[PDB]
Amino acid sequence: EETLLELNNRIRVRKQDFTLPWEEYGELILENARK
Amino acid sequence: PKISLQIPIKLKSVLVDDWEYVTKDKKICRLPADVTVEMVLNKYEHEVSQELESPGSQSQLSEYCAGLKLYFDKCLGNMLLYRLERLQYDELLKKSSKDQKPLVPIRIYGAIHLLRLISVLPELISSTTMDLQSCQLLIKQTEDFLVWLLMHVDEYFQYEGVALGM
């Protein structure tokens, strides 16, 4: 069991603009349009 | 194969309000935030360590909070910014160069950018070589932090920002 502090330099960082994934947030994004 | 991370629907809704405010209303956060990432994680560790009996339980929480600060400092400028927020960042980066003082994101940004980090943690874990039990602890500690964040949701809280294939 390694903690996040010891995994810090093994979990690669992406270079990208931040997004929300559609499969998890799409229903909320569509409801948000109807406000 | 999915790295399962339960994020309460209220907190997912917080992330979508933020997405609307930035990418639709075109309104950036005022910086520095009043309650930085560092202060959110300091308070969390400070409270939750009072309800843990095991000594190994206290170390793993401290190593979680420390690792999460460290990873926020690495991710923020690489993958946690909407395009609209890059000018703000590039200006902070510019002040850091002129004032000869390094940029420390956990001391500038706030709770919402921390929650952005959490939202992408499953995708980051998924490509990583690590022990399964280390991943399960990572998931457990984050879900614990999340329900503490939800517990304090009122205290802390042209087109871009949606990945249709994800």
Numbering used by the authors:
A (entry chain D): 108 to 142
B (entry chain A): 218 to 374, 393 to 401
Task: Give the authors' words.
The Rpd3S complex functions to repress transcriptional initiation within the coding region of genes during RNA polymerase II elongation by maintaining hypoacetylation.
To address these unknowns, we identified a region within Eaf7 (aa 108–143) as the Eaf3MRG binding motif using GST pull-down assays and solved the structure of Eaf3MRG bound with Eaf7108–143 at a resolution of 2.40 Å. Residues 111–142 of Eaf7 are visible in the complex and adopt two helices (α1 and α2) connected by a long linker. Eaf7108–143 binds to Eaf3MRG mainly via hydrophobic interactions. α1 of Eaf7108–143 interacts with α3, α5 and α6 of Eaf3MRG mainly via hydrophobic interactions; the linker region of Eaf7 interacts with α3, α4, and α5 of Eaf3MRG via hydrophobic and hydrogen bonding interactions; α2 of Eaf7108–143 packs against α1 of Eaf3MRG. The main chain carbonyl group of Eaf7 Glu131 is hydrogen-bonded to Eaf3 Lys229, which forms an additional polar interaction with the side chain of Glu131. Consistently, mutagenesis and GST pull-down assays showed that L114A, I118A, R121A, D124A, and E131A of Eaf7108–143 slightly reduce the binding to Eaf3MRG, while F125A and L127A of Eaf7108–143 abolish the binding. Furthermore, ITC binding assay showed that SUMO–Eaf7108–143 binds to Eaf3MRG with a KD value of 1.0 μM but displays no binding toward the Eaf3MRG–Rco1PHD1–SID complex. All MRG-binding ligands contain a common helix–linker–helix motif, such as α3–α4 of Rco1, α1–α2 of Eaf7, and α2–α3 of MRGBP. In addition, the solved structures confirm that Eaf7 and Rco1 bind to the same surface on Eaf3MRG, which complements our understanding of how Eaf3 resides in distinct histone modification complexes.
